[PDB]
């Protein structure tokens, strides 16, 4: 449940080397990958776990283009009269809600992608904090 999400966001070792915002961004990516692996069709989703006030809620991104391949993530650039879009690009929907984020394969892919994201963020931060000293002699 979301109490487990709070426990894992407050139980990190590098608490500020990976802020809560980026924690939940990586967790949203995890849940999106899990929901992608759930359905046989490919459909991009956003989570918005509601860091402090509430739980998560999956969505359904359209990636508005004039193509039709896998129409789960296809919609024309002019479909804006019904379903209340009034849009040209960026039309995304919020159709599917309340996916499962605690089963076996979901937990596995979440752990894997969280490890990947934390190692990437730590490396990027430890390199960027020294990038300001470019063109200098450093020990080590």
């Amino acid at each position: 449940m979301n109490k487990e999400i709070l426990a894992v966001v407050e139980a990190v070792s590098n608490e500020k080397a990976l802020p809560r915002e980026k924690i939940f961004e990586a967790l949203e990516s995890a849940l999106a990958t899990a929901t992608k692996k759930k359905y046989e069709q490919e459909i991009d989703v956003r989570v918005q776990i509601d860091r402090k006030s509430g739980d998560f809620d999956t969505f359904r991104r359209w990636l508005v283009v004039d193509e039709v391949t896998q129409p789960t993530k296809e919609i024309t650039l002019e479909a804006a009269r019904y379903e209340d879009e009034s849009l040209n690009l960026g039309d995304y929907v919020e159709d599917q809600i309340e996916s499962v984020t605690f089963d076996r394969i979901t937990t596995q892919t979440a752990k894997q992608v969280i490890v990947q994201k934390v190692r990437e963020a730590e490396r990027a931060m430890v390199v960027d904090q020294f990038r300001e000293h470019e063109g200098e002699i450093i020990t080590g």
Partner: protein, 50 residues
């Protein structure tokens, strides 16, 4: 009724039809285009021969 009467119809003529919201439209677009084809095409050989 026939599938050929639906493949020659862009989705613009679906969301305007009543009782075609999110679940119905999503189910249609999933179970129609997953078979290789898509929704909305231009052809003239229809219906042979009925």
């Amino acid at each position: 009724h026939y599938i050929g009467d639906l493949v020659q119809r862009t989705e613009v003529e679906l969301l305007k039809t009543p009782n075609l919201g999110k679940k119905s439209l999503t189910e249609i677009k999933d179970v129609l285009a997953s078979r290789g084809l898509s929704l909305g095409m231009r052809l003239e050989n229809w219906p042979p021969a009925s």
